[PDB]
Amino acid sequence: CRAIHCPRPHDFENGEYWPRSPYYNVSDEISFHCYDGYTLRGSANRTCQVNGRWSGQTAICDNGAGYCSNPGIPIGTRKVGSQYRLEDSVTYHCSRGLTLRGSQRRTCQEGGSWSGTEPSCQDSFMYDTPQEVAEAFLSSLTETIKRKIVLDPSGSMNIYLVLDGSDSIGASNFTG
Amino acid sequence: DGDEYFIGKYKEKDETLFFASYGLKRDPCQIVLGYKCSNNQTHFVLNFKTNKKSCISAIKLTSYPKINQNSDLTRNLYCQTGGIGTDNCKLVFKKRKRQIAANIEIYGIPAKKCSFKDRYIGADPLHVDSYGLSYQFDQEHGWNLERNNIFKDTRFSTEVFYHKNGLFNTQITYLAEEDSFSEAREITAKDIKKKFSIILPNEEYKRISFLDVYWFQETMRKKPKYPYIHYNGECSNENKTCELVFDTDELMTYALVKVFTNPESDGSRLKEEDLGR
Ligand SMILES: *[C@@H]1O[C@H](CO)[C@@H](O[C@@H]2O[C@H](CO)[C@@H](O[C@@H]3O[C@H](CO)[C@@H](O)[C@H](O)[C@@H]3O)[C@H](O)[C@H]2NC(C)=O)[C@H](O)[C@H]1NC(C)=O
Ligand SMILES: *[C@@H]1O[C@H](CO)[C@@H](O)[C@H](O)[C@H]1NC(C)=O
């Protein structure tokens, strides 16, 4: 068993980041900074911890001359497409030894928002801790105001739970 | 088709200040002509400040697609710092879940000699008010009723405050059949203070019998704070020049008073259930 290596950025358009190295150890820092006449959104200082993911959000430098905004390049992927008007599409894919999790193609809808979710490809050894799982489940299931569920008048919900009992655990009779 | 919201009244001899189209799901906006906005899940605000010497006249907003809700019982457009007559105000609009576009236009007129009396006074002041709805009385007492199909509000008992197209209203007293129209008076933005007054004549056959005020203003939140328009002292027969005094909690930008005259008025006229504390 060897050390944990955080992924190395692949592309960055209209900007520059410090420093550069073939691979980044644990608790190393990267700082982004981009050209004149643009605007930076996100986090400027990013560091990777023991989990294997960079801490913060994605850094996006934008100009402000399109119907729908810049999607940005998630760290580790590669983007194809450079048209930011109505009815165009953008595709993502990342490097070798990584498996994608999210949307493959995104389309600029009528309102001004994209259709899908921002991809960020993972590897074998990254797990999810209970805190983030609970937070994401609660945030997706309900809406904020505290947090209450919204229904239309004369509305209803139908929950369907599907388990499997194949030879994967074999623990008594569905215990746990 | 799409729904529409108005502020002010339009005239056929006005030039456009600007004209733009906005999406209502992007984050952030697209900065158009170096202006500022803000967009949230339930709010869309815009900042405007012109450079040329002009006074604004009307604002209009159009939204798509059509939704099943009337657009006169509540407030959806209002600007928070300024208004009509002042060269800038900060527009605020409240969205829904199904609105995804907006078109905005602003009209104005040259600053020096701009006055709005020629529009809101109408062509038949004795039969139609500024709103457009005609008067209608009671045949057994000759007192006008209360129009009911507009957004109306009360502070305490025995008070009324109407609203329509960004224009408020307040009727001082009750109106009789045989009243006459004398004149109208307007107050511009350079003579507006936190507290002020106005002088009117009551000489012989110019007896004041009815006063109704129209004014624009600003609102910090969706719940407004109506100003106190009380009637200084008592305007009986003896005191010929009668004053009207305002007491505002927020700054207005325009006012208009339509004096009515009736020689038969004795100075007191009140309903049989309005009278006791
Ligand atoms: C989305 O943005 C809108 C404005 O674009 C937010 O509405 C505004 O929020 C501010 C911040 O809370 C309010 O200002 C606050 O007013 C109090 C009143 O006493 C005063 O102490 C401060 O000035 C304070 O900042 C503002 O009233 C409010 N409404 C406006 C500007 O019309 C809205 O809250 C945002 N959405 C969310 C979910 O926060
Ligand atoms: C009525 O007359 C009195 C006489 O002193 C005067 O003080 C008051 O201002 C007058 N009121 C009006 C409304 O003219």
Side-chain angles (χ1 to χ4, degrees), chain A residues 19 27 50 72 84 86 92 116 155:
Chain A
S27 83
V50 291
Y84 297 141
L86 197 41
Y92 303 88

Short mmCIF file of all heavy atoms in Angstrom, two decimals, chain A residues 19 27 50 72 84 86 92 116 155:
data_model
loop_
_atom_site.label_atom_id
_atom_site.label_comp_id
_atom_site.label_asym_id
_atom_site.label_seq_id
_atom_site.Cartn_x
_atom_site.Cartn_y
_atom_site.Cartn_z
N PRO A 19 1.84 26.44 -7.70
CA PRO A 19 2.95 26.11 -8.58
C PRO A 19 2.60 24.94 -9.49
O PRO A 19 1.42 24.65 -9.66
CB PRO A 19 4.07 25.73 -7.61
CG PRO A 19 3.36 25.26 -6.38
CD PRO A 19 1.93 25.71 -6.43
N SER A 27 -1.73 17.86 1.72
CA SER A 27 -1.59 19.20 2.32
C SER A 27 -0.65 20.09 1.50
O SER A 27 0.28 20.70 2.03
CB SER A 27 -1.14 19.11 3.78
OG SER A 27 0.27 18.95 3.86
N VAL A 50 -6.51 14.50 3.37
CA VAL A 50 -6.34 13.05 3.37
C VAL A 50 -7.44 12.33 2.60
O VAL A 50 -7.22 11.22 2.11
CB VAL A 50 -6.26 12.53 4.82
CG1 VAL A 50 -4.97 12.98 5.47
CG2 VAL A 50 -7.46 13.01 5.61
N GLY A 72 -17.18 26.16 -16.86
CA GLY A 72 -15.92 25.93 -16.20
C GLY A 72 -15.42 24.51 -16.36
O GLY A 72 -16.16 23.59 -16.72
N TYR A 84 -21.21 29.67 -26.44
CA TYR A 84 -22.01 29.96 -25.26
C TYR A 84 -23.23 30.79 -25.60
O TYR A 84 -23.56 31.76 -24.92
CB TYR A 84 -21.16 30.67 -24.20
CG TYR A 84 -20.01 29.83 -23.69
CD1 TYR A 84 -18.78 30.40 -23.42
CD2 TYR A 84 -20.16 28.47 -23.49
CE1 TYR A 84 -17.73 29.64 -22.95
CE2 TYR A 84 -19.12 27.70 -23.03
CZ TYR A 84 -17.91 28.29 -22.76
OH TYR A 84 -16.86 27.52 -22.30
N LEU A 86 -27.51 30.32 -27.33
CA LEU A 86 -28.65 29.42 -27.18
C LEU A 86 -28.49 28.17 -28.05
O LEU A 86 -28.03 28.24 -29.19
CB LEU A 86 -29.94 30.16 -27.55
CG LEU A 86 -31.25 29.53 -27.10
CD1 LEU A 86 -31.12 28.98 -25.70
CD2 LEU A 86 -32.37 30.56 -27.15
N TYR A 92 -17.65 16.71 -21.76
CA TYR A 92 -16.54 16.52 -20.83
C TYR A 92 -16.03 15.09 -20.91
O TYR A 92 -16.77 14.17 -21.24
CB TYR A 92 -16.95 16.80 -19.38
CG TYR A 92 -17.52 18.16 -19.11
CD1 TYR A 92 -18.88 18.40 -19.25
CD2 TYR A 92 -16.72 19.20 -18.69
CE1 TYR A 92 -19.41 19.63 -18.99
CE2 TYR A 92 -17.24 20.45 -18.43
CZ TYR A 92 -18.59 20.65 -18.58
OH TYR A 92 -19.13 21.89 -18.32
N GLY A 116 -28.19 19.34 -16.65
CA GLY A 116 -27.42 18.23 -16.15
C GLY A 116 -26.75 18.59 -14.84
O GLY A 116 -27.24 19.44 -14.10
N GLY A 155 -51.92 17.09 -3.79
CA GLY A 155 -50.73 16.37 -4.20
C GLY A 155 -50.37 15.23 -3.27
O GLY A 155 -50.86 15.16 -2.14
#
